[PDB]
Scaffold this active site. Structure first.
Site, mmCIF file in Angstrom:
data_model
loop_
_atom_site.group_PDB
_atom_site.id
_atom_site.type_symbol
_atom_site.label_atom_id
_atom_site.label_comp_id
_atom_site.label_asym_id
_atom_site.label_seq_id
_atom_site.Cartn_x
_atom_site.Cartn_y
_atom_site.Cartn_z
ATOM 1 N N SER A 16 0.866 -1.188 0.000
ATOM 2 C CA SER A 16 0.000 0.000 0.000
ATOM 3 C C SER A 16 0.901 1.236 0.000
ATOM 4 C CB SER A 16 -0.946 0.026 1.198
ATOM 5 O OG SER A 16 -0.234 0.240 2.406
ATOM 6 N N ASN A 22 -0.219 4.662 1.376
ATOM 7 C CA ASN A 22 -0.699 5.751 2.241
ATOM 8 C C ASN A 22 -0.123 5.648 3.637
ATOM 9 O OD1 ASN A 22 -3.291 5.155 0.326
ATOM 10 N ND2 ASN A 22 -3.231 7.273 0.949
ATOM 11 N N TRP A 71 -1.233 6.783 7.383
ATOM 12 C CA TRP A 71 -2.292 7.297 8.263
ATOM 13 C C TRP A 71 -2.100 6.816 9.689
ATOM 14 C CZ3 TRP A 71 -5.344 3.837 10.873
ATOM 15 C CH2 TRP A 71 -5.314 2.514 10.394
ATOM 16 N N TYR A 89 -8.326 -2.350 3.118
ATOM 17 C CA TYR A 89 -7.297 -3.406 3.125
ATOM 18 C C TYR A 89 -7.995 -4.780 3.134
ATOM 19 C CZ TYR A 89 -4.333 0.450 4.607
ATOM 20 O OH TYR A 89 -3.647 1.629 4.706
ATOM 21 N N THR A 148 1.989 -8.509 4.275
ATOM 22 C CA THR A 148 1.265 -9.797 4.288
ATOM 23 C C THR A 148 2.153 -10.806 5.007
ATOM 24 O OG1 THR A 148 0.011 -9.370 2.312
ATOM 25 C CG2 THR A 148 0.397 -11.683 2.759
#
Length: 326
Positions: free
Chosen positions: A35, A37, A39, A75, A218
């Site tokens: 991913s 981003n 946050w 997700y 993962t």
């Protein structure tokens, strides 16, 4: 050479401490190559997950700048919605000024509630960043805070310390041999071609090639449900009552290596890495999850793979570099 130490949580998750704001408020974030981003939870969040994790307060930061823009991310496990703000993010001894990030408003569900980390720091390409928010590594490079436009990951095994993300460098002490370079096929995830997956010189899956992503976020080795079903039979894994794919612990000693051939090079994963120990029993490190894309159906080379191979993520030349861990 700027290093971020990561804590290993039961060989399932790898996260580290970042500082956001002036003065710095501390968060634990998953360093996630699947991913893009960044946050953290904020004081605007009242979901259960926000009540037991660290919450960013924009009001205590002299360097906070607000936007009228929101972000929503989904997700595999869980969902968040938040608002985009700008502040200084302190990551791996770098002061990443004018970094856009999400302040959560909602964090639905139970996964994020029981998880030891507060947020996510995505390390993949800007093309998959929700709300086109500039990723951390892109903003570090664009501001010229590193010299080499790469980062490298070392993930420890057996709940040990020592895991690191090295921003703007490589460190030869973590690997044996020389790096093998693999071109990124599609610039989104860290996506590569696997030539074949073999066991005792026979293709068990991906006989004529397949697309895979190198994902620090993962835990397991993931692929399409149908090929994974064959692999589970091939290793003598059976479904139990709890839903788990069990295999006899005793049987590790007689199982072959599964070989991932990437760019004409062999990357073996031993039975001691691909079968995991959970509570007196042993379970398969293979998981079936159908992820359809433009370039067929993806495999995820999760932490089971990354523990065996020091991985370099090169943004200047759009390459993944692999070598066996020391």
């Amino acid at each position: 050479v700027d290093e971020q130490p990561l804590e290993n949580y039961l060989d399932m998750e790898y996260f580290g401490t970042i500082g956001i704001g002036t003065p710095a408020q501390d968060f634990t974030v998953v360093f996630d190559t699947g991913s893009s981003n960044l946050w953290v939870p904020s004081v605007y969040c009242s979901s259960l997950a926000c009540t037991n994790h660290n919450r960013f307060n924009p009001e205590d930061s002299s360097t906070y700048q607000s936007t009228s823009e929101t972000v929503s991310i989904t997700y595999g496990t869980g969902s968040m919605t938040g608002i985009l703000g700008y502040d200084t993010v302190q990551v791996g001894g770098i002061s990443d000024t004018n970094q856009i990030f999400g302040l959560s408003e909602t964090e639905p569900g139970s996964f994020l509630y029981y998880a030891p980390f507060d947020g996510i720091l995505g390390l993949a390409y800007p093309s998959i960043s929700s709300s086109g928010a500039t990723p951390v590594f892109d903003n570090i490079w664009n501001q010229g805070l590193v010299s080499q436009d790469l980062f490298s990951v070392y993930l420890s095994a057996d709940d040990q310390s020592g895991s690191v993300v090295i921003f703007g460098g490589i460190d030869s002490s973590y690997y044996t041999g020389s790096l093998n370079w693999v071109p990124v096929t599609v610039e989104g995830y860290w996506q590569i071609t696997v030539d074949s997956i073999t066991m005792n010189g026979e293709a068990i899956a991906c006989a004529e090639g397949c697309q895979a992503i190198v994902d620090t976020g993962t835990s397991l080795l993931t692929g399409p449900t149908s090929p994974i079903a064959n692999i589970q039979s091939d290793i003598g894994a059976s479904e139990n009552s709890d839903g788990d794919m069990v295999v006899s612990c005793s049987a590790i000693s007689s199982l072959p290596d599964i070989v991932f051939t990437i760019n004409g090079v062999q990357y073996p994963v031993p039975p001691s890495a691909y079968i995991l120990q959970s509570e007196g029993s042993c379970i398969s490190g293979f998981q079936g999850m159908n992820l359809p894309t433009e370039s067929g159906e993806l495999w995820i080379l999760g932490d089971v793979f990354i523990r065996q191979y020091f991985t370099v993520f090169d943004r200047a030349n759009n390459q993944v570099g692999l070598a066996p861990v020391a």
